[PDB]
Amino acid sequence: AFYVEVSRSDEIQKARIQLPVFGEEHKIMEAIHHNDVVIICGETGSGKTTQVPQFLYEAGFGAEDSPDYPGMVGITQPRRVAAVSMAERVANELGDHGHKVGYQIRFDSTAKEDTKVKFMTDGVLLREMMHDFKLTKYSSIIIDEAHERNINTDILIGMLSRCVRLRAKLHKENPIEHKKLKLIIMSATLRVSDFSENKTLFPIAPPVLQVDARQFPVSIHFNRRTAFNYTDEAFRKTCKIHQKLPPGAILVFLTGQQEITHMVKRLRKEFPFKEEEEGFEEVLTEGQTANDPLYVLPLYSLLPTKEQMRVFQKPPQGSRLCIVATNVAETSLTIPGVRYVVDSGRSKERKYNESNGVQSFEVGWVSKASANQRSGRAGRTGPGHCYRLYSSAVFEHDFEQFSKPEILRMPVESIVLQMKSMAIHNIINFPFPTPPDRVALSKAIQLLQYLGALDNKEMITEDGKKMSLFPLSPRFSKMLLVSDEKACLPYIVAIVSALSVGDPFINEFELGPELKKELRSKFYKSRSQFSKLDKFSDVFRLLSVVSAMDYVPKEQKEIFMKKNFLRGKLMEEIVKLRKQLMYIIKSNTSAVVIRNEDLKSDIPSVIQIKLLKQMICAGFVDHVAVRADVLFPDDAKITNRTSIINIPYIPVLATRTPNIEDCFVYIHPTSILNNLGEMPPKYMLYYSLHLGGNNKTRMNTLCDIASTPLANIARKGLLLTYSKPLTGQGLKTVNLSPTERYCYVVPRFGSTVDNDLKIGWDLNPIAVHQKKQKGQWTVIKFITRKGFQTITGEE
Ligand SMILES: [Cl-]
Ligand SMILES: [Cl-]
Ligand SMILES: [Cl-]
Ligand SMILES: [Cl-]
Ligand SMILES: [Mg+2]
Secondary structure, three states: OOOOOOOOOHHHHHHHHHOOOHHHHHHHHHHHHHOOEEEEEOOOOOOHHHHHHHHHHHHOOOOOOOOOOOOEEEEEEOOHHHHHHHHHHHHHHOHHHHHHEEEEOOOOOOOOOOOOEEEEEHHHHHHHHHHOOOOOOEEEEEEOOHHHOOHHHHHHHHHHHHHHHHHHHHHHHOOOOOOOOEEEEEEOOOOOHHHHOOOOOOOOOOOEEEOOOOOOOEEEEEOOOOOOOHHHHHHHHHHHHHHHOOOOEEEEEOOOHHHHHHHHHHHHHHOOOOOOOOOOOOOOOOOOOOOOOEEEEEEOOOOOHHHHHHHHOOOOOOOEEEEEEOHHHHOOOOOOOEEEEEEOOEEEEEEEEOOOOEEEEEEEEOOHHHHHHHHHHHHOOOOEEEEEOOOHHHHHHHOOOOOOOHHHOOOHHHHHHHHHHOOOOOOOOOOOOOOOOHHHHHHHHHHHHHOOOEOOOOOEOHHHHHHOOOOOOHHHHHHHHHOOOOOOHHHHHHHHHHHHHOOOEOOOOOOOOHHHHHHHHHHHHHHHHOOOOOOOOOHHHHHHHHHHHOOOOOOOHHHHHHHOOEOHHHHHHHHHHHHHHHHHHHHOOOOOOOOHHHHOOOOOOHHHHHHHHHHHHHHOOOOEEEEHHHOOHHHHOOOOOOOHHHOEEEEOOOEOOOOHHHHOEEEOOOOHHHHOOOOOOOEEEEEEEEEOOOOOEEEEEEEEOOHHHHHHHHHHOOOEEEOOOOOOOOOOOEEEEOOEEEEEEOEEEOOOOOOOOEOOEEOOOEEEEEEEEOOEEEEEEEEOHHHHHHHHHHO
């Protein structure tokens, strides 16, 4: 009721007083009492994850005798293992009340009667809000690890902002029947402005509580210049610190495991056991040399627990601890005695942009906020130093102020489909902590209707639910749904994995003197080995290389990448994704274990590659470009002599301008299409459009598509209108009743002749089966020339 008396052992209680959050109990509880929403900032090691549910439990949260907080305390974690290990920790810590702690890591499981403090995943809470949005079961909700900005955590916070508001309104109407809901958002960092200062999320700003003790100052040292070889500059800087500066451990921030492993051994080999620069004014203390040993250790998420745990050990006497890490060391447990940070200023992050034609997983500059978080790592135990391996001008102009959340680095239609499967109806006005653009949101809902994932009322369909089962862009999930025809499924999973991961082919990002011409000969010979399936499709060049990979032995892999100018990491990743999709497909046809041998396939037949282009079309129906001379010959200025990269194309649904040349897109010089001795295809399917270096928009081409296959896909994809029945020789309308007919129509793809400020075009005349439904003729199916001839013969 008022308070709950918990009995803990002296060992357990003394361990709790040591935690930085322990003394913050009264400030935290004063904020919760006066505010329905509270934001708590404290690093990992502060104890806020394990202590705040206990502070609530002790104040009467979850107590049946409580007139205010009878409901449970719910705590989300972004990972299943974190929720279980956290529940285990708090159960021990709560002593004689330890039986009141539980976890939920499945939707299936029903909680135990004594569970009053429940640790779960975001997914479990999201599912619970589908069954009961009000979450009447809870008195409180703690959203931990909110600085990660995971897409489902952001949706959950958005949903909860509305839930807390409604719980507040119902409580004001009837405090007996309706209880308050306490929302606590937790962050390892101070970067909470997208939660605290967002008025759509929180109209009245919630208090932000700082639980950490104050840090020590850190002197920031920029380099005069920004070195291209940053691992070389990082190695150089690390050695200079070790050889010249007083005691204190070193922390190096690199981008990945291979850079780490290479530097770790380069440093171990440099300091083994038995002009003018900033930040080198300090000298070595007595009993310290320039050639002392360096105890080097790697630090990355993939390392085994026993290897990760070594970063906390004191280095051997007479040596210096040097940690070589990725951004895991940005918000991890405090590595003791660090007074030197070597910052490369970069990280490998997945980027994706709308209207910009961006899709990358690569090394780029980090935000100013991440650079500062890296810097502050040197001032945890005492005043430290940070060595930035870039200039202050590059920092100021090339580093963005803030790090981009996941919701802005992932396809907008993936976010919309995920929300729609959760029965979140109004997307346009959803209170996102960081909202995607309204135009992009509107475009994502329309795309989903073209893919059949949402119906005419914008509700999730049966196909949309199946597509939501894959960790893929709905374009790719659509392709999978239509692929199980004439055994094309293994080919589509291969294409979809390759397109999803990125382009493994290295192009003339190298040489396009005598040695340069010699390498182009090997380049083109390699490129032509994967161009054998179709002469128009860059997508089957991907299928060929991915299919070749499966027949290459593990030892020979590296030379296979070298001979063929291939991104090895990308090829390994495609094999990983194909196995993950194969696991999902097989697991939905009822334990499943996919091996490298299950991925091996034979060459697709002529019928199969025709069908695959149509399956690609289903996922990319709004991404068709017509050869400009079929629409605007005078403006196109295409001769039989024009080069392939100079022949313009017009994307369907492109917005018209006074000058049609504004709508022109062109074949990329790296495309298979450049080897054509003929006029390129009338209709081309494209992955994406890129605003090129020569100021020309270039198509990232997939494959060609013929008129009738495009018509079939555009009919199901709702991008077709038809003309009135055609009149002509052997074209005559055959009426089965005044409500049923078979006739020839001209299909209109995309946009009508009348609506000429958006690009559309006519397809080849086609035989059609039509039924007069609600006073208007509707196309039931397309008919072949032979099919039509038999119907005209039957009548
Ligand atoms: Cl449990
Ligand atoms: Cl956006
Ligand atoms: Cl492609
Ligand atoms: Cl291309
Ligand atoms: Mg619509």
